[PDB]
Write a protein that binds this ligand. Structure first.
Ligand SMILES: CC(C)Cc1ccc([C@@H](C)C(=O)O)cc1
Length: 139
């Protein structure tokens, strides 16, 4: 083994905690999440952990609601069971330094974008005309 070099996604690596969430309930409604799930998922305050190992990116989310973990290679689709229990087909790419996560299921699609803004990691969840913004800071 030799030690690898860095990459642009290193800006994302680390441990992040949710500090603010706007219009997430409306997002979840638009996605089709049911009442009891929305209310408990909307109350969650996740720690999000992003790591890189070679070509593989891992995103872990930990909360009192659910713990999730996905591992992927940019541009390479995978199967994902989401925290709300949708079975989706997911592809995650970089677009100009934004991590773009598209989920497809049941003829529907939603996009989750992650972007660095100052010391924060901003998450933008989009379902048709409904957007939710979630802001994370370093743990
Ligand atoms: C319909 C919802 C429950 C799916 C969902 C949206 C956003 C996240 C992460 C990015 C988050 O910020 O918690 C996780 C799950």
């Amino acid at each position: 083994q030799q030690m690898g070099r860095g990459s642009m996604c290193d800006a994302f690596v680390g441990t992040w905690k949710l500090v603010s969430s706007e219009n997430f309930d409306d997002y979840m409604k638009e996605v089709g999440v049911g009442f009891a799930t929305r209310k408990v998922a909307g109350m969650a305050k996740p720690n999000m952990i992003i790591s890189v190992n070679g070509d593989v990116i891992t995103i872990k989310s930990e909360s009192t609601f659910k713990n999730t973990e996905i591992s992927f290679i940019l541009g390479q689709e995978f199967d994902e069971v989401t925290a709300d229990d949708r079975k989706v087909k997911s592809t995650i790419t970089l677009d100009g330094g934004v991590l773009v996560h598209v989920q497809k299921w049941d003829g529907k699609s939603t996009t989750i974008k992650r972007k660095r803004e100052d010391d924060k990691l901003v998450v933008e969840c989009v379902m048709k005309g409904v957007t939710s913004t979630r802001v994370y800071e370093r743990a």
